[PDB]
Copies of this chain bind each other. A is one copy, B any other.
Amino acid sequence: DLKLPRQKVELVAPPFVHAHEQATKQGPKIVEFKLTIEEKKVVIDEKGTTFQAMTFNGSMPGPLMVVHEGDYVETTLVNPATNTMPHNIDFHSATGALGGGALTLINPGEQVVLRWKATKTGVFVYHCAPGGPMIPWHVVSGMNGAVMVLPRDGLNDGKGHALKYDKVYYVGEQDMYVPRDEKGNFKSYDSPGEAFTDTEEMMKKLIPSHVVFNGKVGALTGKNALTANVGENVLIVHSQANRDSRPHLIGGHGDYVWETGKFGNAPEVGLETWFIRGGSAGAAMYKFMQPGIYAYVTHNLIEAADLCATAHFKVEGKWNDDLMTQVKAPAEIP
């Protein structure tokens, strides 16, 4: 009965984002996505700590889905028989049925197809939510991602001017709760079910052992640093499905920031640090002015430096001595 064109999207792993238009002359379509749930034991730090992860499409965060206002998002959610638990999906962008959660509960061996109309613009969390105490556990195990619903005319600054990004990255931040044994070492478990009792006990005390971007300490550093060039406008979408975060680009700013993440509201300008409320996504754009390394952090610096929540940008281009210069290099005090 819904007679619109269908478009398939090939999702890509974060922090990258599948190809899409900002402004578009397309009208509404049914945009088709597939998410396959994977439960897996992963390594989350450089010491080799393991973690019983539960993921959409194998990644933490789940991939960014991008559509336009008035599109219909049709998701095939697949829970292979190789998984152990039921799962579902709640889209904060969607209206009704607990975001879709009440229509998508699938046992191992099942799949389901949900369609929702993208009536609200912005960046939004999606996450699993199977019921009761399982809700936080599946979310903090990694089962969360985001979806971006763009205006058909692209982004604007609330003063009539278009804001076009040259690239977009998705940084998903994950609070993780890994219990310790008596002597103080992190515990390893054979299954998510086996990890549950100790992990819930820790969860209820509200202090994570790790806070990471893209699923691991250091994920977005070295070979996998984010990149830009001087003169490039970069959009950084940041999500946190369970706990607050305060993003900050060290050596830069948020030129235009939607900290609550919703494009019906004008962006704020010229921020140092912004705030992602737990259960939300927000977005910040910045035009790089200087080359070199930047760190992108949550500005609880204990979390950033000690618990895992640091990414890098490596930026190419020409240094601008008008903006900053070392007038006198380090020298002995006279």
- Whether B242 and A244, one on each chain, are in contact in the complex, defined by CB atoms closer than 8 angstroms, is no
- Whether A324 and B116, one on each chain, are in contact in the complex, defined by CB atoms closer than 8 angstroms, is yes
- Whether B111 and A253, one on each chain, are in contact in the complex, defined by CB atoms closer than 8 angstroms, is no
- Whether A103 and B326, one on each chain, are in contact in the complex, defined by CB atoms closer than 8 angstroms, is yes
The interface residues of chain B lying within 8 Å CB-to-CB of A252 are 95
Q: Which of A15-23, A50-58, A132-140, A187-195 contacts B (4 or more CB under 8 A)?
A: A132-140
- Whether A331 and B270, one on each chain, are in contact in the complex, defined by CB atoms closer than 8 angstroms, is no
- Whether B330 and A295, one on each chain, are in contact in the complex, defined by CB atoms closer than 8 angstroms, is no
Can you show 27 pairs from A to B with CB atoms below 8 A apart? Answer: A92-B272, A92-B273, A95-B251, A95-B252, A95-B289, A96-B289, A96-B292, A99-B251, A102-B251, A106-B330, A107-B330, A111-B328, A112-B326, A112-B329, A114-B324, A133-B305, A139-B301, A204-B307, A205-B207, A242-B300, A244-B246, A262-B268, A262-B270, A262-B272, A264-B270, A272-B281, A278-B300
C-alpha spacing A74/B272, complex, angstroms: 20
Q: Say whether A42 faces chain B, with CB atoms less than 8 Å apart.
A: no
Given the known interface contacts A98-B293, A305-B133, A333-B80, the answer about A277 and B280 at a Cβ–Cβ threshold of 8 Å is no
A 286-313 to B, binary, CB cutoff 8 A, 1 in contact else 0: 0001101111000111111111000000
C-alpha spacing A206/B206, complex, angstroms: 10
Q: Say whether A31 faces chain B, with CB atoms less than 8 Å apart.
A: no
Lowest 10 CB-CB distances: which A-B pairs, in order? A279-B299, A96-B290, A113-B328, A136-B301, A273-B279, A113-B327, A92-B272, A96-B324, A273-B280, A264-B269
C-alpha spacing A135/B272, complex, angstroms: 17
Min distance, Cβ A45 to any Cβ of chain B, angstroms:
13
Min distance, Cβ A67 to any Cβ of chain B, angstroms:
15
- Whether B268 and A278, one on each chain, are in contact in the complex, defined by CB atoms closer than 8 angstroms, is no
Apart from A96-B319, A135-B305, A242-B300: 6 A-B pairs, beta carbons within 8 A: A104-B326, A113-B328, A244-B244, A260-B274, A272-B281, A273-B277
Q: Say whether A71 faces chain B, with CB atoms less than 8 Å apart.
A: no
> Chain copies in the assembly?
3
C-alpha spacing A331/B109, complex, angstroms: 8
Given the known interface contacts A204-B307, A302-B204, A306-B200, the answer about A253 and B324 at a Cβ–Cβ threshold of 8 Å is no
The interface residues of chain B lying within 8 Å CB-to-CB of A93 are 272
Min distance, Cβ A176 to any Cβ of chain B, angstroms:
12
Closest residue of chain B to A80 (Cβ to Cβ) is B333
A 226-270 to B, binary, CB cutoff 8 A, 1 in contact else 0: 000000000000000111101010111100000111101100111
Closest residue of chain B to A30 (Cβ to Cβ) is B327
Min distance, Cβ A252 to any Cβ of chain B, angstroms:
7
Closest residue of chain B to A110 (Cβ to Cβ) is B330
The interface residues of chain B lying within 8 Å CB-to-CB of A304 are 135-136
Q: Say whether A100 faces chain B, with CB atoms less than 8 Å apart.
A: yes
